[PDB]
Amino acid sequence: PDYHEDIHTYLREMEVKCKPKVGYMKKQPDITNSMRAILVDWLVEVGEEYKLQNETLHLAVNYIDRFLSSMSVLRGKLQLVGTAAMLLASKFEEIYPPEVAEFVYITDDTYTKKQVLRMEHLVLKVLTFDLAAPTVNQFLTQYFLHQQPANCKVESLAMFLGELSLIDADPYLKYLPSVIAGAAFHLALYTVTGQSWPESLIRKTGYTLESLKPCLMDLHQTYLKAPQHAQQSIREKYKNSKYHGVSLLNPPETLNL
């Protein structure tokens, strides 16, 4: 609270430096956005099974996107990239990271422990060890401090929305985490309480409903079409009482902007 601004400022600077290449999928010969949605959905499953932090999952997705931004990968190796990213994310963020054997186990023994570790090494190289990336989650928790008063359904809905964005490279790869965080927070706050992006977050972030609008429009459609999405692990996850079953809430029909 004596560093909240310093840290926000710093994270805002770093999210630009840690941003994936917006159009990297066009340059991927073998893989597609849909395959990526499949991998990310699975990573949510893995997160649940090992009770990993949400932050860990966000980090792992940051690592995958940044890696695939400079390295071509065949579809048969995409999961290996993902496994190693989750492993690294876990090592970075978790009090007790699942052991390597456990990661080797959840890939249905598609890959050897030796491959998983070699890929870990390669990922570190390609990211030059820059793992402390800003995430939607990091911005959300700061934004939550501006509630009056705090509302658990809103935080869980926001988390849920922020998390849905990880699935679809198109279009969310073009929005910075701090912006998806803002869109998610306003959408959750509106859905649950009917209120809006608070004046105090405008002072803090410089973002307005107007600047958020483009991301907000996408995220709104994502929210509306969620039950029809091919990938369903985030909705299953947020049916849980841990997150106040917010996936079961009804999305607003109109945002009115």
Partner: protein, 296 residues
């Protein structure tokens, strides 16, 4: 960024739970470095992954500089700038002379600077003690050993409970607080500040409860007045002896009024009242701060 081809080992320096440290000379540039070797069956250790990534973000005069990472088959070599010794060694050597107050003031000022920087970049050190503060022959002191460090969030989550070397561990960790923060690093510096003045540790406990009791006998046993929420902390006990707080001037007798003021703020029981590294920089204790060079 090259390979070990250009490094010439000069001598071993010491060891870590993961690393072996050598003094080395770059043969083309003449630069003296400290090489930390990390041998690699669970892949790259988490501590090494934290240390490298956080350290690459922290470029500061009072943070030890990671110069390079040589990442090979079975070996990970971290290349650090070379510093001459640690604060612990210096205090020992300064046995009978004592450390001149202007040099204490200087070191503390510098340490608050490096620390404020860490906290400004959402990093907790979590292992500040004289063994991890390195000094050079030009008056600088720098935080080192970011193996226990952690990237934190706002507001903090629950992180590893088993943190900070015992003598320098904050009461909120001892009492099982689910949510410690930057204040734990300030607690540690408070202990180091007192230690530089007396040249003996301030709370040399041999166990957790011994550590708590030693703290309590010095600062008074905390109650809901001095520290709201204390009695509902997990490892707090109603049977705790209730000691009076002693006059702070007896805690570190050689310290002047400004020094005492500052020390007391760094050792406030309530993490929320405990002064931040940032705010401490502006304390009157530092009004005449300079940068003396120490003695070999």
């Amino acid at each position: 960024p090259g390979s070990m081809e250009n490094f010439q080992k000069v001598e071993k320096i010491g060891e870590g739970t993961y690393g072996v440290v050598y003094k080395a000379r770059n043969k083309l540039t003449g630069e003296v470095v400290a090489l930390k070797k990390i041998r690699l069956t669970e892949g790259v250790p988490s501590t090494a992954i934290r240390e490298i990534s956080l350290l690459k973000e922290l470029n500061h005069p009072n943070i030890v500089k990671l110069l390079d990472v040589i990442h090979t088959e079975n070996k990970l070599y971290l290349v650090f700038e070379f510093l001459h010794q640690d604060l612990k060694k210096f205090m020992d050597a300064s046995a009978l002379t004592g450390i001149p107050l202007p040099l204490i003031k200087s070191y503390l000022f510098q340490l608050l600077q490096g620390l404020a920087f860490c906290h400004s970049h959402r990093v907790l050190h979590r292992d500040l003690k004289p063994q991890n503060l390195l000094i050079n022959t030009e008056g600088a002191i720098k935080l080192a050993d970011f193996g226990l460090a952690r990237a934190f969030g706002v507001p903090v989550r629950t992180y590893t409970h088993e943190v900070v070397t015992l003598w320098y561990r904050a009461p909120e960790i001892l009492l099982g607080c689910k949510y410690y923060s930057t204040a734990v690093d300030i607690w540690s510096l408070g202990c180091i500040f007192a230690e530089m003045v007396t040249r003996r540790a301030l709370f040399p406990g041999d166990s957790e409860i011994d550590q708590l009791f030693r703290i309590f006998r010095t600062l008074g046993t905390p109650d809901e007045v001095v520290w709201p929420g204390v009695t509902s902390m997990p490892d707090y006990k109603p049977s705790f002896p209730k000691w009076a707080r002693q006059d702070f001037s007896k805690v570190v007798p050689p310290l002047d009024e400004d020094g005492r003021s500052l020390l007391s703020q760094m050792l406030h029981y309530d993490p929320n009242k405990r002064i931040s590294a940032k705010a401490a920089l502006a304390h009157p204790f530092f009004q005449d701060v300079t940068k003396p060079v120490p003695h070999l």
